[PDB]
Ligand binder design. Structure first.
Ligand code: MG
Ligand code: ZN
Lengths: 674, 625, 161, 237, 82, 30, 226
RNA sequence: CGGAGAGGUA
């Protein structure tokens, strides 16, 4: 997310377009965007097109315009000496697609190769006309869109959704790099600044959870300190753990420690889960998801989150503000946790409502116990307290003495409502977490971990997820193409070291130059047995599953495999919210807004139209009078419900009286005749 | 009628009720103790909470509330978790999927308020869309697939009926559906094989009842032989007892017909229970339908290369003609566009022919569940032409499907047109909101006030103009111009007696009788002609589409009309003459369209002369002016 | 409307909107569009002021126009000339008798200042206004017929208790 | 270990022979575990008796009609097939049904030898007209579950005998569901709702008891590997 | 011709709308009867004067609206318009 | 061939790449 | 057609922690159902032992790092959770692991008291470089199925206590394959082949016995009508 | 808890 933020092209700033005013000619893909701005990975809402992303190979010239590398092709020879062309000069010449079949001899196979002619018109042409060439089939896409495997098999909309989702995956407690990634994951992590790349080659001397100490090849020692369990801008843990031993030798530019979402230096935003593509009893209905309970018991998707609570004691004109332990008009039991200074002892599970920092307000006893407490909907242990004291000549703001701050951390397992999503735009919310017993299990008893509805794939034109599932099965099982008598025809151009792979063999399919369909067919045709000489998944890629709920085998084979899915930062724990009564607004006496200060959901203007259309008059009247801004009405309704008495009658909206006063203030004698 | 509610949300919404019940049950001597018990969640608050929330409707709301059914009242049930559980059938009404959508919960308090929530707004009572009266609690997606699979007859299946061979008696005849189910659970019978059963609980069809029982009826308990598949027996066992046997493959149209017939003939509770049972059956049998996706299931047309080369030759000939100056740029682009459109159509035809009838993709498409064959072509055959940012087609065109994998240029030129779609969707929802607000404001004070103004003014509906050679062809758009009206006059044909009396709802039987009688026009009462001083009358408005009966005397029909016209604004695309949402805006605002095409003012011949940038359309005054 | 009258423009508007909606495969029964069109064709423009106090060129509602003409003829006749007129939905929305509804709809400053000049009194008879003041909307279960039902046990059931 | 809830078996009689049994607080995975086992054991474990084959005089090759009888052969076949007969002898016993002249043929008109008993004497087998005569010989052997028609073992042994499907099981139809039933900080448990429909031979209560016996025997055989093993016990009463 | 209605959907709404003309009428019918039943409940401890308790034997704790709807279904009550 | 040679501790992630790589991805934060 | 042969169960031992049990003759169609009943019972209702909570010397919370270990404490928990214990005491017991100085720290170094026995020595826990000391106290307890982290405040405990999720499942994986004999003679039967694979805490025979006992109890409760 | 801005979800 950070790396994509640092490479964003926002067209809306002071001196730039306005979101409300921006039209439809700017919110578009221009043929000059090829290799300079990504035609995918755009905000899905009102910022559709006003916030782009800089492509992978693009760079900015001294003036400010963007340039993209090419590969100067001369006399039909695709020569090196890349030249960074700009858009204007790009128009003049004719660019060639790198996926074009260069025969390693500086000459295309066929004469007709598609090229962006002048004004982004793709056309064929003879090799003499061709002037330049792309660097890679993977140049127009950005850094987060390049991590989608089988991108060319997804439709632009779903690829955009997947690219915008890879930036939302939460760091899981454990990380697992994809079996079927693309390759833009080691560089996307070493160029993001979260993996601690070694400064200079050397030999690790002492490696611990909090410090590596590279003993350089010149007698110098450079200890790398690991930021353990920190808080990111979005409350997500920032674990860094060493991945080297005390005897290893590292090289300059080598990854020496993992980061938040990393596995051996590569981006790992999710986990590899065994997935079935069948509809199942309607629980995975309309984009919902069914998870196995194994993902909850084994912490397969269990993210650590940290919240940052702060409170300060201002000098104020009156003076004497102090963070004291003794809380006026308080109980002893509630004060047990606080330490001598008045700060909770680190390692205590501060549940919602518990005291964190006893603060008194000497309104120069005039001391309100305005103590920082575990806010509404918070929990978890206290992992760190930071207090800055004026007496310690700290750089505090003007007019304070202490700036105590607390961190509460909480491990959130995956539950019903969380928003797992693959890399292809196949987002959904967990509809049910089935127990591991009643799950479709393969012939060998292995229960599938997740079930995805069949009706979501063909409609949305993101078949790339199915290919990812097949190749994930192939990678997990391992394969061995039998070249006993000549290599197979479908594997002639398959690279060596890919004709045989041991189980759990991570592969990569570059974004636009990866695994063809025939190669997937073949690698499914030849896969190793699991433990006994039984192949659980046939050539089609579909297994014969057993319904764990009833026992009978499903009548037809079911597509199974391993798909990489990511836990998005849209957990249900942050969205559930309810109000019976609480804080009310001040000017208009309506309730307050937002989950933070309790707050109440807004009965919008077009939710009054629905009630009026229903003809429900009394419900609308009560909602607008005795629930919102009829103060006497509100209190009497509460008393009526707590007691047994009938619900009272309404009054006058305080909002209407506010409007009357404002209309008078304008200079208009509004009056309510009789 | 039910919704699942997180217990930790119910505990907060129903806090005063729980406090009162705790004090009542002596679990807290005073209100403060009960409040503390609720705050600390002692193990008995849940026990009293399930009693408290029992039979207390809760209005679930989703934003945007585009139409009336965006707010519906369900019965709360505590569910373990932190997510509201929404019954799958109200998803279409709320327009709610499960990809992260949230919903608001509202609890009415006063006895009046709960009466509205339980009668006016209960979900089970709201099955028909007020915009058109079509059912909205109809099975869809997985339910449609499951019922389509269950109700299918596949020839040559296990346990199929076989005649006598002259050596052994008939085979595949079952004494009752219980025996058929017993055979199916033993593997000897397939739930989609034609069999002859002896039914005694399913009402026979009309013709079979007429030619077997006659008399008065089938008098349940009476037996009759039915040659059908076990699945169709199971499906018809979910319809009401009195419903005639439906031996058909349950496409989504067929299921819609069943649901609408139940709505128009049976009480609403019967319809609700029927849709619930169909939901259960469809969800059960969609799991067993074996619908999955694999690249082996996505078959490709066999001779795609041949067709592509054939049309590439035409493209080459057009290009050479353009090179020799035979035509300009526009003609070349038009010719290539036509060539490649023909190519895409031919490839789609070949792909349609190639797929079997049981391919899961084709099963889901033909089942009416979701999607169309355009998407199937795009996935398997070829995507075809793509649009420039201006709007003109790219003459390349895209030539690789999403199964074979698009090249770099094809993907780029596809994104070209995809982004415009997304952006226009956003801008058009923004515009449709404003249009709906204006429509709700203009017609907020139209209310049914009188039961009948007893006027005679009315409007005439086209109602199936007669054919030239002589035949009564039904007008295609009659469901939205003649049904749910009340006649302003009587109907008499060929000096015959009155076919339909004045003041009739003019439903299916009435329109069928009118067409059989052989009359093409009828005058019906319309709100345009209501004589009430303030608001429309109930008879002029006609049937209330939602309830299926005559509109009530307090109905706020203006807001309903505004919402019904303004809810399908997102569906209506924003696509020099305006032809979309801008056209609707400049219509309802009556601004000056886009091109004010002149209209005639008097009858007579025209003496048009042709020029450039103008004409001379002069109309002779046949009247004589 | 000027050439073929109000009925023709009504059918034309209904047909146009239905064409636009049918093109996109959306079914809306014509009675909703008819309600809206009825609302659009409510007023008449004043050609001749006459003895009645109607400024020429001012669009007044049909009820007021007819009633004032019928009053004037009964008490010193000089009937006023009036042509049927078509108004967009914004003009019709802002021309309401209630300055409160029009003010809450759009152009609050213009509506409020013109109301202040004309000293208009708002009969709180609408739905939006009754919502604003927090009184029962005159619709559905707010009609005088329904809010004043008289429930009571029957004499037989009363005795049985 | 011990389970603190101990589900409760409650029955709700609907018809003279049709019930809807409801268990209750079942640990939150046992609604199906025992439900489907009980369904299949109710269907095919319970011994019963049904007609295996019949022979009708006058019908050897042509199976289109029976002379002197209004109904075709297949209707007679599937009317006899729905004959609730209970037997004790393990051997296949033979029954004869003969009637002459116009009238109605009823299940009571078949003479049952010592053994087989017709639990539904009133059942419309056939009608007769024009001095018609019917004489059909049945064979009954006690079995279990549903057994489709068995083809002739020796074709030369009999030419008139024709086999029919055998619904040995006295239980006709069983269906089950599960629901969530608890407010005890855990609204996640199961409630199995059986729906047993049986013939006149056995009341659904006794059929459910027999299925329970069968499953107890099978799972006791399973448990015999280790008697003193630690497991979950519902407890006595 | 239906299975036993369960919960909020009991009694059937059509059998209720038989006693009245409009759902708007049944709304106020049930609301007013529920108010009267609640008034009886709150007056039982105090001096019972005119608020007559429910007529159909109320369930274990059936809320007043449910009892009123059952009474309207059994047709104990009577209503007049205004 | 494989993932890459530029990074020393690159995991052995085999690639289905057919085309070669004339250039290496620049510094992304550059 | 009254098949007269009662089912008989025979066992096959493929290895110490796996075995195939064969049950025949079952009535046709009643193989899958019985096998699935046994599978469901085995995968959810087999009692076992697991660690309930821990306490390491110099850590107050579970989001810190012991000095001298390459494993953050969280990874230590993730490693410990893969232990395979078999306890006989019906009450919480305690186990201690003590190490100091260079060398890897594995489950073999654990010293259990009488009763509980660690069934997979040598897996992994942590590595100590030069100056790391690990003194971790475990609390083994008996249970069934799955039980989330027992809250520290709800059950009175100290600040240094770290509740750990407990998965008591002694069964690892289960399946079955039914061999159905379909013959025109109609002397049909089903042969079930149950493959129980336990995680070395209890032999598959014990797990099958526990499942049988549970199902016998339930269907005996179902046998109270007549 | 009032304003301004940014990002995001449906
Ligand atoms: Mg959604
Ligand atoms: Zn009228």
């Amino acid at each position: 997310s950070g790396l994509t933020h640092k490479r964003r092209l926002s067209a809306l700033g002071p001196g730039g377009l306005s979101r409300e005013r921006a039209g439809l000619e700017v919110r578009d893909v221009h043929p000059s965007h090829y290799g300079r701005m990504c035609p995918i990975e755009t905000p899905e809402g009102p910022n559709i097109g006003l916030i782009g992303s800089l492509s992978v190979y693009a760079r900015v010239n001294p003036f400010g315009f963007i340039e993209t590398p090419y590969r100067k092709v001369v006399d039909g020879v695709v020569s090196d000496e890349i030249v960074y062309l700009t858009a204007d000069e790009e128009d003049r010449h004719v660019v060639a697609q790198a996926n074009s079949p260069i025969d390693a001899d500086g000459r295309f196979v066929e004469p007709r190769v598609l090229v962006r002619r002048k004004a982004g018109e793709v056309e064929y042409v003879p090799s003499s006309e061709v002037d330049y060439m792309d660097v890679s089939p993977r140049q127009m896409v950005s850094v987060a869109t390049a991590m989608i495997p089988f991108l060319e098999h997804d439709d632009a909309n779903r690829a955009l959704m997947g690219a915008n989702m890879q930036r939302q995956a939460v760091p899981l407690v454990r990380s697992e790099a994809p079996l079927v990634g693309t390759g833009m994951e080691l560089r996307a992590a070493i160029d993001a600044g979260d993996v601690v790349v070694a400064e200079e080659s050397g030999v690790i001397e002492e490696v611990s959870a909090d410090y590596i100490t590279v003993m350089h090849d010149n007698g110098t020692r450079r200890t790398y300190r690991m930021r353990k369990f920190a808080r990111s801008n979005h409350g997500t843990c920032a674990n860094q753990c060493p991945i080297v031993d005390a005897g290893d030798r590292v090289e300059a530019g080598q990854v020496i420690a993992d980061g938040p979402c990393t596995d051996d230096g590569e981006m790992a935003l999710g986990k590899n889960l065994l997935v079935a593509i069948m509809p199942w009893e309607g629980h995975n209905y309309e984009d919902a998801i069914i998870l196995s309970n194994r993902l909850v018991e084994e912490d397969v998707l269990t993210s650590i989150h940290i919240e940052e609570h702060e409170i300060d004691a201002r000098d104020t004109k009156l003076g004497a503000e102090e963070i004291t332990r003794d809380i006026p008009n308080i109980s002893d039991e509630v004060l047990a946790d606080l330490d001598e200074r008045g700060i909770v002892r680190i390692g205590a599970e501060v549940r919602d409502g518990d005291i964190l920092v006893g603060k008194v307000t000497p309104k120069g006893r005039e001391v309100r116990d305005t103590s920082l407490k575990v806010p509404h909907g918070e929990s978890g242990k206290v992992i760190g307290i930071r207090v800055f004291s004026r007496e310690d000549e700290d750089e505090l703001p003007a007019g304070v003495n202490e700036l105590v701050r607390v961190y509460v951390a909480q491990k959130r397992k995956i539950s019903d409502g969380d928003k797992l999503a693959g890399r292809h735009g196949n987002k959904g919310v967990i509809g049910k977490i089935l127990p591991v017993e009643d799950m479709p299990f393969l012939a060998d008893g292995t229960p599938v971990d997740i079930i995805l509805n069949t009706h979501g794939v063909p409609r949305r034109m993101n078949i790339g997820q199915i290919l990812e599932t097949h190749l994930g099965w192939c990678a997990h099982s391992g394969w061995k193409v039998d070249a006993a008598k000549g290599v197979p025809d479908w594997a002639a151009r398959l690279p060596d070291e890919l004709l045989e792979a041991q189980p759990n063999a991570i592969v990569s399919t570059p974004v636009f130059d990866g695994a063809q369909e025939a190669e997937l067919q073949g690698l499914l045709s030849c896969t190793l047995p699991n433990r006994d000489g039984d192949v659980l998944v046939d050539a089609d890629g579909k297994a014969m599953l057993f319904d764990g709920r009833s026992g009978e085998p499903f009548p037809y084979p079911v597509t199974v495999g391993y798909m990489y899915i990511m836990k998005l930062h849209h957990l249900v724990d942050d969205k559930i919210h309810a109000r019976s009564t609480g804080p009310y607004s001040m000017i208009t006496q309506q309730p307050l807004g937002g989950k933070a200060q309790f707050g109440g959901q807004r009965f919008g203007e077009m939710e009054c139209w629905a009630m009026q259309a229903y003809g429900a008059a009394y419900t609308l009247q009560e909602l607008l009078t005795i629930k919102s801004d009829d103060t006497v009405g509100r209190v009497k309704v509460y008393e009526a419900i707590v007691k047994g008495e009938n619900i009272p009658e309404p009054g006058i909206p305080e909002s209407f009286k506010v409007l009357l006063k404002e209309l008078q203030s304008l200079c208009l004698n509004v009056e309510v005749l009789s | 009628h039910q919704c699942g509610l997180p217990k930790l949300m119910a505990l907060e919404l129903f806090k005063p009720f729980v406090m009162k019940r705790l004090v009542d049950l002596n679990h807290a001597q005073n209100i403060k103790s009960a409040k503390r018990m609720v705050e600390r969640q002692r193990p008995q608050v849940w026990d009293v909470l399930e009693e408290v929330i029992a039979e207390h409707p809760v209005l679930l709301n989703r934003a945007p509330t585009l139409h009336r059914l965006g707010i519906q009242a369900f019965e709360p049930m505590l569910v373990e978790g932190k997510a509201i559980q929404l019954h799958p059938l109200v998803c279409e009404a709320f327009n709610a999927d499960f990809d992260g959508d949230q919903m608001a919960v509202h609890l009415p308090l006063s006895a009046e308020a709960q009466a509205e929530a339980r009668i006016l707004m209960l979900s089970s009572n709201n099955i028909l869309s007020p915009a058109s009266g079509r059912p909205l609690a109809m099975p869809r997606l997985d339910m449609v697939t499951g019922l389509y699979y269950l109700t299918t007859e596949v020839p040559g299946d296990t346990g199929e009926y076989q005649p006598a061979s002259g050596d052994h008696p008939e085979t595949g005849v079952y004494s009752s559906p219980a025996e058929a189910i017993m055979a199916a659970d033993r593997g000897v019978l397939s739930v989609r094989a034609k069999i002859k059963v002896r039914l005694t609980q399913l009402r026979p069809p009309v013709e079979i009842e007429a030619e077997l029982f006659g008399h008065s009826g089938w008098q349940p308990g009476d037996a009759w032989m039915a040659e059908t598949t076990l699945g169709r027996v199971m499906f018809n066992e979910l319809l009401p007892l009195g419903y005639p046997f439906v031996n058909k493959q349950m496409h989504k149209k067929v299921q819609a017909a069943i649901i609408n017939d139940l709505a128009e003939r049976y009480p609403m509770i019967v319809v609700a229970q029927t849709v619930d049972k169909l939901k259960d059956a469809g969800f059960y049998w969609a799991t067993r339908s074996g619908v999955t996706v694999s690249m082996a299931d996505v078959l490709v047309p066999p001779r795609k290369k041949e067709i592509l080369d054939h049309y590439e030759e035409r493209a080459d000939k057009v290009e050479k003609q353009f090179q020799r100056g035979a035509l300009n740029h526009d003609e070349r682009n038009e010719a290539l566009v036509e060539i490649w459109k023909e190519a895409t159509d031919e490839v789609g035809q070949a792909l349609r022919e190639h797929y079997p009838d049981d391919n899961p993709i084709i099963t889901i498409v033909d089942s009416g569940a979701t999607g169309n064959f355009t998407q199937t072509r795009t996935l398997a055959g070829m995507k075809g032409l793509v649009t420039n940012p201006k709007g003109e087609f790219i003459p390349r065109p895209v030539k690789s499907s999403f199964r074979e994998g698009l090249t770099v240029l094809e993907y780029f030129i596809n994104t070209h047109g995809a982004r415009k779609g997304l952006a226009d969707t956003a801008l058009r929802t923004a515009d449709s909101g404003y249009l709906t607000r204006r429509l709700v404001d203009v017609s907020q004070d139209v209310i049914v006030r009188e039961h009948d103004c007893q006027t005679e003014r009315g409007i005439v509906v086209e109602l199936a103009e007669r054919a030239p050679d002589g035949t009564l062809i039904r007008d295609p758009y009659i469901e939205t111009s003649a049904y749910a009206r009340t006649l302003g006059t009587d109907a008499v044909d060929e000096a015959g007696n009155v076919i339909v009396e004045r003041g009739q709802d003019l439903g299916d039987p009435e329109i069928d009788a009118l067409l059989a009688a052989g009359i093409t026009q009828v005058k019906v009462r319309s709100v345009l002609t209501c004589a009430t001083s303030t608001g429309v009358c109930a008879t002029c408005y006609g049937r209330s589409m939602a309830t299926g009966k005559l509109v009530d005397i307090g109905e706020a029909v203006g807001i309903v009309a505004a919402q019904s016209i303004g809810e399908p604004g997102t569906q209506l695309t924003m696509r020099d003459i305006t032809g979309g949402l801008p056209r609707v805006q400049e219509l309802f605002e009556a601004r000056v369209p886009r091109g004010k095409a002149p209209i005639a003012d008097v009858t007579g011949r025209v003496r048009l002369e042709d020029g450039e940038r103008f004409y001379k359309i002069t109309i002779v005054p046949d009247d004589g002016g | 409307l000027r050439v073929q009258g109000p009925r023709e423009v009504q059918i034309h508007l209904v047909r146009e909107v239905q064409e636009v909606y049918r093109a996109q495969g959306v079914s809306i029964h014509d009675k909703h569009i008819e309600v809206i069109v009825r609302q659009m064709l409510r007023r008449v423009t004043i050609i001749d002021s006459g003895s009645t106090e109607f400024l020429p060129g001012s669009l007044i509602d049909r009820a007021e126009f007819e009633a004032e003409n019928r009053r004037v003829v009964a008490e010193g006749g000089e009937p006023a000339a009036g042509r049927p007129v078509l108004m967009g939905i914004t003009k019709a929305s802002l021309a309401t008798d209630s300055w409160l509804s029009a003010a809450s709809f759009q152009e609050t400053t213009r509506v409020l200042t013109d109301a202040a000049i004309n000293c208009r009194s708002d009969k709180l008879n609408g739905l939006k206004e009754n919502v604003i003041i927090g009184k029962l909307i005159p619709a559905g279960t707010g009609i005088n017929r329904y809010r004043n039902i008289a429930v009571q046990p029957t004499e037989e059931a009363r005795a049985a208790a | 270990m011990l389970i603190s809830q101990r589900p409760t078996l409650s029955e709700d009689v609907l018809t003279d022979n049709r019930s809807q049994f409801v268990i209750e607080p079942l640990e939150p995975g046992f609604g199906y575990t025992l439900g489907n086992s009980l369904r299949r054991t109710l269907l095919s474990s319970i011994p019963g008796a049904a007609v295996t084959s019949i022979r009708i005089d006058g019908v050897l090759h042509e199976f289109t009609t029976v002379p002197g009888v209004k109904e075709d052969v297949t209707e007679i076949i599937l009317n006899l097939k729905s004959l609730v007969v209970s037997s004790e002898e393990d051997e296949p016993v033979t029954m004869y049904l003969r009637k002459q002249g116009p009238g109605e043929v009823t299940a009571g008109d078949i003479v049952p030898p010592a053994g087989v008993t017709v639990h539904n004497p009133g059942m419309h087998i056939a009608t007769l007209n024009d001095k018609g005569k019917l004489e059909v010989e049945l064979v009954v052997e006690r079995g279990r579950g549903y057994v489709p028609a068995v083809q002739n073992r020796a074709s030369g042994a009999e030419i008139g005998r024709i086999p029919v499907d055998s619904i040995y099981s006295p239980v006709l139809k069983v269906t089950y569901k599960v629901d969530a039933t608890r407010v005890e900080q855990r609204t996640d448990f199961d409630k199995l709702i059986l729906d047993v429909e049986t013939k006149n031979s056995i009341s659904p209560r006794d059929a459910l008891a027999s299925a329970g016996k069968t499953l107890v025997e099978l799972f006791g055989l399973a448990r015999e590997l280790n008697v003193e093993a630690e497991g979950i016990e519902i407890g006595p009463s | 011709g239906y299975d036993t209605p369960l919960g909020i959907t009991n009694p059937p709404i059509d059998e209720l709308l038989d006693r009245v003309s409009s759902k708007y009428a049944l709304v106020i019918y049930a609301a007013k009867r529920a108010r009267q039943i609640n008034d009886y409940y709150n007056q039982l401890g105090e001096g019972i004067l005119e608020y007559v308790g429910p007529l159909v034997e109320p369930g274990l704790q059936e809320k007043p609206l449910s009892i009123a709807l059952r009474e309207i279904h059994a047709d104990l009550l009577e209503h007049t318009e205004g | 061939s494989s993932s890459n040679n530029s990074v020393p501790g690159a995991p052995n992630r085999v690639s289905f790449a057919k085309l070669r790589e004339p250039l290496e991805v620049p510094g992304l934060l550059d």
